[PDB]
Short mmCIF file of C-alpha atoms in Angstrom, two decimals:
data_model
loop_
_atom_site.label_atom_id
_atom_site.label_comp_id
_atom_site.label_asym_id
_atom_site.label_seq_id
_atom_site.Cartn_x
_atom_site.Cartn_y
_atom_site.Cartn_z
CA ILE A 1 0.00 0.02 0.04
CA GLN A 2 1.12 3.61 0.49
CA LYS A 3 1.87 5.23 3.78
CA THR A 4 2.15 9.01 3.93
CA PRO A 5 5.50 10.40 5.06
CA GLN A 6 5.70 11.93 8.52
CA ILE A 7 8.08 14.88 8.49
CA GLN A 8 9.74 16.61 11.46
CA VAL A 9 12.13 19.52 10.95
CA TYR A 10 14.38 20.48 13.83
CA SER A 11 17.95 21.55 14.73
CA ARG A 12 20.56 19.40 16.61
CA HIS A 13 21.07 21.94 19.38
CA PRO A 14 18.90 24.74 20.84
CA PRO A 15 19.42 27.51 18.18
CA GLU A 16 21.29 30.75 18.80
CA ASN A 17 21.57 33.52 16.20
CA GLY A 18 24.91 33.55 14.50
CA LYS A 19 26.07 30.40 16.24
CA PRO A 20 26.76 27.34 13.93
CA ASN A 21 24.16 24.53 14.46
CA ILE A 22 22.81 21.67 12.40
CA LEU A 23 19.46 21.48 10.71
CA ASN A 24 17.79 18.07 10.45
CA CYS A 25 14.68 16.71 8.67
CA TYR A 26 13.43 13.37 9.94
CA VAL A 27 11.10 11.72 7.42
CA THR A 28 9.30 8.57 8.68
CA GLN A 29 6.54 6.12 8.19
CA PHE A 30 6.46 6.38 4.35
CA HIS A 31 6.00 3.76 1.73
CA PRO A 32 7.12 3.08 -0.92
CA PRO A 33 10.78 3.89 -0.28
CA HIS A 34 10.86 6.15 -3.30
CA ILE A 35 11.22 9.72 -1.75
CA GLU A 36 12.62 13.07 -2.45
CA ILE A 37 13.85 15.15 0.51
CA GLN A 38 15.21 18.56 -0.12
CA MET A 39 16.30 20.95 2.56
CA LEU A 40 15.94 24.64 1.70
CA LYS A 41 17.10 28.06 2.93
CA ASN A 42 14.98 31.10 2.11
CA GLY A 43 13.19 29.17 -0.62
CA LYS A 44 16.50 28.04 -2.19
CA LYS A 45 17.88 24.55 -2.20
CA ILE A 46 20.92 24.03 0.02
CA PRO A 47 23.36 21.79 -1.91
CA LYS A 48 25.55 20.40 0.84
CA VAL A 49 22.89 18.18 2.43
CA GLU A 50 23.68 14.70 3.62
CA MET A 51 21.53 11.61 4.08
CA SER A 52 21.60 8.80 6.56
CA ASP A 53 21.15 5.33 5.06
CA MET A 54 17.61 4.41 4.23
CA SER A 55 16.10 2.02 6.72
CA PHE A 56 12.62 0.91 7.93
CA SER A 57 11.10 0.24 11.32
CA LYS A 58 9.58 -3.00 12.67
CA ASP A 59 6.18 -2.15 11.23
CA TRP A 60 8.01 -2.10 7.87
CA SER A 61 7.62 1.63 7.18
CA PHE A 62 10.75 3.40 6.02
CA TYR A 63 12.50 6.19 7.66
CA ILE A 64 15.47 8.46 6.68
CA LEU A 65 17.10 11.62 7.94
CA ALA A 66 18.61 14.70 6.16
CA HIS A 67 20.92 17.20 7.68
CA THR A 68 23.28 20.12 7.00
CA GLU A 69 25.40 22.82 8.47
CA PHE A 70 23.69 26.15 9.20
CA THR A 71 24.17 29.33 11.23
CA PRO A 72 20.60 30.44 12.07
CA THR A 73 19.57 34.14 12.01
CA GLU A 74 16.46 36.17 12.63
CA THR A 75 16.01 36.62 8.91
CA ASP A 76 16.58 33.25 7.20
CA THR A 77 13.86 30.59 6.76
CA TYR A 78 14.55 26.95 6.51
CA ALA A 79 12.35 24.06 5.30
CA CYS A 80 12.26 20.47 4.08
CA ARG A 81 10.38 19.81 0.86
CA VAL A 82 9.36 16.21 0.55
CA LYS A 83 7.78 14.43 -2.52
CA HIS A 84 6.20 11.07 -2.20
CA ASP A 85 3.63 8.94 -4.13
CA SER A 86 1.36 8.72 -1.13
CA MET A 87 0.70 12.45 -1.74
CA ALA A 88 -0.65 14.57 -4.54
CA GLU A 89 1.72 17.49 -4.06
CA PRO A 90 5.18 17.80 -2.48
CA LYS A 91 4.80 18.58 1.22
CA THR A 92 7.03 21.34 2.72
CA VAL A 93 7.70 21.98 6.40
CA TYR A 94 9.39 25.09 7.81
CA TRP A 95 11.65 24.87 10.84
CA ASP A 96 10.14 26.50 13.99
CA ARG A 97 12.52 27.70 16.68
CA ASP A 98 10.21 26.27 19.27
CA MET A 99 9.48 22.94 17.62
CA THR B 1 28.05 -9.91 10.80
CA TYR B 2 25.73 -9.78 7.71
CA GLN B 3 24.20 -13.11 6.77
CA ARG B 4 23.40 -14.39 3.21
CA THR B 5 19.87 -15.46 2.38
CA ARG B 6 19.77 -18.95 1.06
CA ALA B 7 16.93 -20.49 -0.94
CA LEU B 8 15.02 -18.11 -3.18
CA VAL B 9 11.33 -17.08 -2.82
CA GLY C 1 22.79 -6.11 28.62
CA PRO C 2 20.22 -6.41 27.23
CA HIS C 3 21.49 -5.77 23.69
CA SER C 4 20.60 -6.38 20.13
CA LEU C 5 22.01 -6.66 16.66
CA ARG C 6 19.92 -5.76 13.53
CA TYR C 7 20.18 -5.55 9.82
CA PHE C 8 17.62 -3.84 7.66
CA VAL C 9 17.92 -4.82 4.05
CA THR C 10 15.89 -3.17 1.34
CA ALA C 11 15.56 -4.05 -2.35
CA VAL C 12 13.34 -2.09 -4.84
CA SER C 13 12.88 -2.79 -8.46
CA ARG C 14 13.39 -0.19 -11.18
CA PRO C 15 11.38 -0.94 -14.28
CA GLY C 16 13.53 0.56 -17.14
CA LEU C 17 16.08 2.19 -14.86
CA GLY C 18 18.44 -0.76 -14.72
CA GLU C 19 18.88 -3.26 -11.91
CA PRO C 20 17.16 -2.66 -8.51
CA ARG C 21 18.63 -0.72 -5.59
CA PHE C 22 19.87 -2.88 -2.68
CA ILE C 23 20.46 -1.28 0.59
CA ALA C 24 21.58 -2.85 3.92
CA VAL C 25 21.98 -1.14 7.23
CA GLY C 26 23.22 -2.82 10.40
CA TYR C 27 22.47 -1.72 13.95
CA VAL C 28 23.54 -2.45 17.59
CA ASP C 29 20.97 -1.14 20.16
CA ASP C 30 19.97 2.30 18.71
CA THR C 31 23.33 2.98 16.97
CA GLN C 32 24.09 2.40 13.25
CA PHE C 33 27.44 0.74 12.55
CA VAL C 34 27.37 -0.68 8.92
CA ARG C 35 25.89 -0.14 5.52
CA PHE C 36 25.73 -1.27 1.91
CA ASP C 37 24.23 0.59 -0.93
CA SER C 38 24.14 -0.69 -4.58
CA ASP C 39 23.80 2.89 -5.78
CA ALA C 40 27.10 3.79 -4.12
CA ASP C 41 30.35 4.02 -6.06
CA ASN C 42 32.06 0.60 -5.71
CA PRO C 43 29.48 -1.04 -3.51
CA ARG C 44 30.81 -2.73 -0.48
CA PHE C 45 30.10 -2.70 3.23
CA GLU C 46 31.51 0.25 5.03
CA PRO C 47 31.74 1.34 8.68
CA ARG C 48 29.47 4.14 9.81
CA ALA C 49 30.64 4.16 13.40
CA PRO C 50 34.20 5.23 14.31
CA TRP C 51 34.74 2.02 16.29
CA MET C 52 33.99 -0.14 13.31
CA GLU C 53 37.03 1.03 11.36
CA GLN C 54 38.89 -0.93 14.04
CA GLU C 55 38.23 -3.91 11.83
CA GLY C 56 40.47 -5.68 9.37
CA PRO C 57 39.94 -5.94 5.54
CA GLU C 58 38.96 -9.57 5.67
CA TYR C 59 35.98 -8.66 7.93
CA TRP C 60 35.05 -6.20 5.19
CA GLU C 61 35.87 -8.49 2.25
CA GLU C 62 33.48 -11.26 3.56
CA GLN C 63 30.68 -8.78 4.46
CA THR C 64 30.75 -7.26 1.00
CA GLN C 65 30.73 -10.70 -0.71
CA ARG C 66 27.45 -11.55 1.12
CA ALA C 67 25.89 -8.26 0.34
CA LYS C 68 26.79 -8.90 -3.23
CA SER C 69 25.22 -12.32 -3.06
CA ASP C 70 21.98 -11.00 -1.70
CA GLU C 71 22.00 -8.34 -4.42
CA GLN C 72 21.57 -11.22 -6.89
CA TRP C 73 19.28 -13.04 -4.58
CA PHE C 74 16.94 -10.11 -4.54
CA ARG C 75 16.93 -9.31 -8.24
CA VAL C 76 15.53 -12.76 -8.81
CA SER C 77 13.25 -13.05 -5.74
CA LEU C 78 11.83 -9.67 -6.95
CA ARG C 79 11.09 -11.04 -10.39
CA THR C 80 9.78 -14.26 -8.80
CA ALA C 81 7.40 -12.40 -6.46
CA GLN C 82 6.28 -10.31 -9.47
CA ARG C 83 4.97 -13.42 -11.18
CA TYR C 84 3.49 -14.89 -8.01
CA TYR C 85 1.21 -11.82 -7.87
CA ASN C 86 0.73 -11.58 -11.62
CA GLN C 87 1.80 -8.00 -11.54
CA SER C 88 3.04 -6.23 -14.70
CA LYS C 89 6.77 -5.81 -15.54
CA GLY C 90 6.81 -2.06 -15.66
CA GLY C 91 6.04 -1.59 -11.98
CA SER C 92 8.55 -1.10 -9.20
CA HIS C 93 8.29 -3.33 -6.20
CA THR C 94 9.83 -3.39 -2.71
CA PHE C 95 11.15 -6.45 -0.94
CA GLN C 96 12.32 -5.91 2.64
CA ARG C 97 14.40 -8.14 4.85
CA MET C 98 14.87 -8.06 8.54
CA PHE C 99 17.10 -10.23 10.63
CA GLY C 100 19.23 -9.93 13.69
CA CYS C 101 19.00 -10.97 17.26
CA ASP C 102 18.15 -10.07 20.82
CA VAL C 103 20.37 -11.24 23.62
CA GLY C 104 19.94 -11.41 27.38
CA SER C 105 22.51 -10.29 29.99
CA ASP C 106 23.81 -13.84 30.04
CA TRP C 107 25.02 -12.99 26.54
CA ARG C 108 23.03 -15.90 25.05
CA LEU C 109 20.43 -15.64 22.36
CA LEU C 110 17.07 -14.60 23.69
CA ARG C 111 15.14 -13.90 20.53
CA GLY C 112 15.85 -14.34 16.87
CA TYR C 113 14.48 -12.52 13.92
CA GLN C 114 14.39 -13.39 10.24
CA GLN C 115 11.34 -11.97 8.43
CA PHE C 116 10.37 -10.67 5.01
CA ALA C 117 7.84 -8.26 3.46
CA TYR C 118 6.74 -7.53 -0.07
CA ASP C 119 5.38 -4.14 -1.20
CA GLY C 120 5.31 -3.05 2.42
CA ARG C 121 3.33 -6.07 3.69
CA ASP C 122 4.37 -9.12 5.79
CA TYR C 123 5.41 -11.86 3.43
CA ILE C 124 7.04 -14.72 5.32
CA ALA C 125 8.47 -14.84 8.83
CA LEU C 126 10.32 -17.35 10.99
CA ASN C 127 8.50 -18.07 14.24
CA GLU C 128 9.84 -17.86 17.74
CA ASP C 129 10.58 -21.68 17.79
CA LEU C 130 13.04 -20.87 14.97
CA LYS C 131 11.98 -24.04 13.18
CA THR C 132 8.69 -23.01 11.56
CA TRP C 133 7.67 -20.37 8.97
CA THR C 134 4.68 -18.04 8.95
CA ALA C 135 3.60 -17.28 5.36
CA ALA C 136 1.36 -14.18 4.91
CA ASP C 137 -0.56 -15.57 1.87
CA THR C 138 -0.93 -18.32 -0.70
CA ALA C 139 1.94 -16.90 -2.74
CA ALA C 140 4.22 -16.94 0.40
CA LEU C 141 3.02 -20.56 0.85
CA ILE C 142 5.05 -21.77 -2.13
CA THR C 143 8.01 -20.00 -0.68
CA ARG C 144 7.60 -21.82 2.70
CA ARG C 145 7.48 -25.20 0.91
CA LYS C 146 10.72 -24.27 -0.85
CA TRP C 147 12.57 -23.04 2.24
CA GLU C 148 11.57 -26.05 4.32
CA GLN C 149 12.60 -28.43 1.51
CA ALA C 150 16.06 -26.82 1.76
CA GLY C 151 15.95 -26.79 5.57
CA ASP C 152 16.87 -23.05 5.57
CA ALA C 153 15.29 -22.58 8.95
CA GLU C 154 18.08 -24.74 10.46
CA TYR C 155 20.79 -22.59 9.07
CA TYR C 156 19.17 -19.37 10.08
CA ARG C 157 18.37 -20.85 13.53
CA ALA C 158 21.99 -21.71 13.66
CA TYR C 159 23.12 -18.22 12.60
CA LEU C 160 21.13 -16.45 15.39
CA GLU C 161 22.42 -18.93 18.04
CA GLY C 162 26.01 -18.45 17.06
CA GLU C 163 27.21 -15.78 14.66
CA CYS C 164 25.13 -12.59 15.31
CA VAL C 165 25.71 -13.15 19.08
CA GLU C 166 29.36 -13.97 18.95
CA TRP C 167 29.74 -10.90 16.74
CA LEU C 168 27.38 -8.85 18.85
CA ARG C 169 29.63 -9.42 21.90
CA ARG C 170 32.49 -8.25 19.78
CA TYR C 171 30.90 -5.12 18.36
CA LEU C 172 29.96 -4.28 21.89
CA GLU C 173 33.58 -4.38 23.09
CA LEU C 174 34.95 -2.37 20.11
CA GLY C 175 32.27 0.23 20.66
CA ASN C 176 32.02 0.03 24.40
CA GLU C 177 32.54 3.74 25.14
CA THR C 178 29.62 4.69 23.02
CA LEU C 179 27.48 1.49 23.09
CA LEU C 180 27.54 1.05 26.90
CA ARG C 181 27.06 4.73 27.61
CA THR C 182 23.76 6.10 28.67
CA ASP C 183 22.99 9.83 28.20
CA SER C 184 20.25 11.02 30.50
CA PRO C 185 17.55 13.26 28.92
CA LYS C 186 17.67 16.96 29.60
CA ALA C 187 14.09 18.19 30.16
CA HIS C 188 12.27 21.54 30.37
CA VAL C 189 8.92 23.00 29.70
CA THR C 190 8.37 25.85 27.23
CA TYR C 191 5.42 28.26 27.57
CA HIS C 192 3.54 29.15 24.35
CA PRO C 193 0.66 31.61 24.68
CA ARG C 194 -2.05 30.03 22.52
CA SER C 195 -5.24 32.02 22.71
CA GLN C 196 -6.40 34.48 25.39
CA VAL C 197 -7.21 31.63 27.75
CA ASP C 198 -5.04 28.80 26.62
CA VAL C 199 -1.28 28.11 26.53
CA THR C 200 0.70 25.34 24.94
CA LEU C 201 3.07 23.77 27.47
CA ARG C 202 5.71 21.42 25.94
CA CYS C 203 8.34 19.45 27.86
CA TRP C 204 11.28 18.23 25.86
CA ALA C 205 13.69 15.37 26.32
CA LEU C 206 17.01 16.13 24.84
CA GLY C 207 20.38 14.41 24.56
CA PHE C 208 19.22 10.98 25.66
CA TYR C 209 20.22 7.37 24.72
CA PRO C 210 18.93 4.68 24.30
CA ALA C 211 16.29 5.90 21.95
CA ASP C 212 13.60 4.35 24.19
CA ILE C 213 12.01 6.84 26.51
CA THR C 214 8.76 7.87 28.28
CA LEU C 215 7.26 11.36 28.18
CA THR C 216 3.92 12.04 29.73
CA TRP C 217 1.66 14.76 31.07
CA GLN C 218 -0.65 14.45 33.98
CA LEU C 219 -3.34 16.55 35.60
CA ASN C 220 -3.81 15.79 39.27
CA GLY C 221 -2.98 12.08 38.77
CA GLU C 222 -4.80 12.16 35.44
CA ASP C 223 -2.85 10.59 32.53
CA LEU C 224 -3.45 12.65 29.41
CA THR C 225 -1.19 10.66 26.98
CA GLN C 226 -4.18 10.68 24.60
CA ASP C 227 -4.77 14.39 24.59
CA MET C 228 -1.06 15.04 24.27
CA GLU C 229 0.73 16.35 21.30
CA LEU C 230 3.51 13.75 21.10
CA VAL C 231 6.11 13.34 18.43
CA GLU C 232 7.85 10.19 17.34
CA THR C 233 11.24 10.03 19.12
CA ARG C 234 13.78 11.59 16.80
CA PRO C 235 17.59 11.46 16.18
CA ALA C 236 19.62 14.62 16.76
CA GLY C 237 22.54 13.52 14.57
CA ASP C 238 25.27 13.23 17.24
CA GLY C 239 24.06 9.77 18.43
CA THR C 240 21.33 10.83 20.89
CA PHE C 241 17.75 11.64 20.61
CA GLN C 242 15.04 14.18 21.35
CA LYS C 243 11.23 14.14 21.84
CA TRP C 244 8.59 16.38 23.19
CA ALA C 245 5.01 16.22 24.38
CA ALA C 246 2.69 19.20 24.46
CA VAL C 247 -0.55 19.97 26.25
CA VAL C 248 -3.01 22.90 25.89
CA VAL C 249 -4.02 24.29 29.28
CA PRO C 250 -6.03 27.20 30.83
CA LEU C 251 -4.35 30.39 32.14
CA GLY C 252 -3.68 30.33 35.86
CA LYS C 253 -3.83 26.55 35.90
CA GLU C 254 -0.50 25.79 34.35
CA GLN C 255 0.93 24.68 37.68
CA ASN C 256 -1.73 21.93 37.87
CA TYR C 257 -0.01 19.86 35.25
CA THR C 258 3.11 17.83 35.53
CA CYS C 259 5.46 16.29 32.99
CA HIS C 260 6.94 12.91 33.75
CA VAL C 261 10.11 11.70 32.02
CA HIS C 262 11.16 8.07 32.37
CA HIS C 263 14.46 6.84 30.99
CA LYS C 264 17.27 4.36 31.61
CA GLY C 265 19.80 7.01 32.63
CA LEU C 266 17.56 8.64 35.24
CA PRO C 267 17.68 6.84 38.64
CA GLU C 268 14.24 8.27 39.28
CA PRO C 269 11.73 9.70 36.73
CA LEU C 270 11.75 13.43 36.34
CA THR C 271 8.82 15.81 36.97
CA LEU C 272 8.29 19.34 35.82
CA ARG C 273 5.87 22.14 36.55
CA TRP C 274 5.67 25.64 35.07
CA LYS C 275 6.13 28.99 36.82
#
């Protein structure tokens, strides 16, 4: 069948303007494994993004994680655009400092 | 240590 | 312990894109230590943990050879399953493989796992007795007949009892400073003015390990883990995890709610109240 991807966007450490941190995008519970995760900054795609190996959970649903280096500011926006068959359109999720 | 599958489906 | 060793192997067909993608990830507890990806350049098992590089080439040779074997094994099994279901040849299909083993503190096998799934659904699975098979459907039934005819169970049953375990004990030593550790969770409750009468309180659990953890909200003994806004525990990237739970509550009643964190590293569950 086709399970919709669950997407959480959050940084590694509590953010601090100007201080280098790491933005992550955890995508889970999706199926099939075909998926397109794209981390963005101010609408633009950030090239230096890395992926953990693809893997599933006991219930068989896949999960993967994307990350990158980033120095948060009060002006820049960040987000994870994810495209998956289970959906009609790509789903995007902006990082919230309190989430 | 990884283990090979044997017989095929 | 208790400890565990797991391998999550994935194989997906690519109709008209060449051969299928074969991925294999190995874990110990909640830490990843090995991987194999057909789409990589010069496929071969590689370490993902620092402590795995402490292993000789022969270890790596052998591991790779098996992964390469299963890459062939899956190409065919995927074409085989395709027929079993009378599906067309231009569609992509996913075959998943799980195997590994749970061990008690006596360092002896406690639970063995060898299971399969096709297109995201249980296909065939070894049982607890490690001598029988549980086929999910009539198609998987012809697969059980085959695997029993070859006595595959025996071999797997043998693998779990010896190999995975013997190796688990080893991986555990090599990666003791990071596998034996236990990072307690760092919790706090953020205040988020919702409406003019509500507020969203959220207590976080940061920097913990193992991944397993308990976060709950309570109102005068009342367990609200059904009215909570609870995420799925998530990895921070440095080897530990985070998680949070949130509750919506009235103004001037925030103090009436408590947050209870339960973890392996905490000698006594934590509790938190706002203000």
